[PDB]
Amino acid sequence: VRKLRAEMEELKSMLSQLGKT
Amino acid sequence: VRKLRAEMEELKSMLSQLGKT
Amino acid sequence: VRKLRAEMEELKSMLSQLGKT
Amino acid sequence: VRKLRAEMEELKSMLSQLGKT
């Protein structure tokens, strides 16, 4: 679940990026 | 996963508000 | 992770609906 | 965790689509 966690970390960045628009 | 969950909850609320515009 | 997956699905569906406006 | 990962990918796709708007 290291890959799982890296995918979640990417998702968080994408979510915060849309949330700053 | 708490921090990811909170980022999703934030975006879901902002989208619901945008849908009332 | 069932509930986190459901929340992702809900958010995905909201984004989809926004993407059709 | 396969289903969580697949839903995450679908969510990321919708996030990317909106960033192209």
Q: Are A14 and D12 in contact (CB under 8 A)?
A: yes
CA–CA min distance C9, chain B (Å): 11
CA–CA min distance B20, chain A (Å): 17
For the record, the structure tokens of B18 come out as 């945008």
Contacts of C10 in chain D (CB under 8 A): none
Residues with Cβ within 8 Å of D14's Cβ and at least 6 positions away in sequence, in order, are: C12, C15, C16, C19
The distance in angstroms from the start CA to the end CA of chain C is 31
Three state DSSP letters for A1-21: CHHHHHHHHHHHHHHHHHCCC
C8:D11 CB<8 A: yes
- Please state how this structure was obtained: X-ray
Dihedral angle of Cα D4, D5, D10, D13, to the nearest 10 degrees:
140
Position A8, amino acid: M
Q: Identify the DSSP state of D1.
A: -
Q: Identify the DSSP state of B19.
A: T
Contacts of C1 in chain D (CB under 8 A): 1, 4
Q: Name the residue with tokens 């994408």.
A: A14
* Neighbour tally for D10: CB within 10 Å: 16
